């Protein structure tokens, strides 16, 4: 579960990665 | 190794 400054994005099919929108960067990791 | 999506929505 995200802490949101972050947003969740999936990938077409499958895959959520954490992005976060101030600092504009997706990553596959979890803070 | 793989690579992240830019962030352009």
Redesign the interface.
Known sequence: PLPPGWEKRT?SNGRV?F?NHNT?????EDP | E?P????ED
């Open positions: 990938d990665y992005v504009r960067i997706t990553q596959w | 793989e992240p999506p830019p962030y």
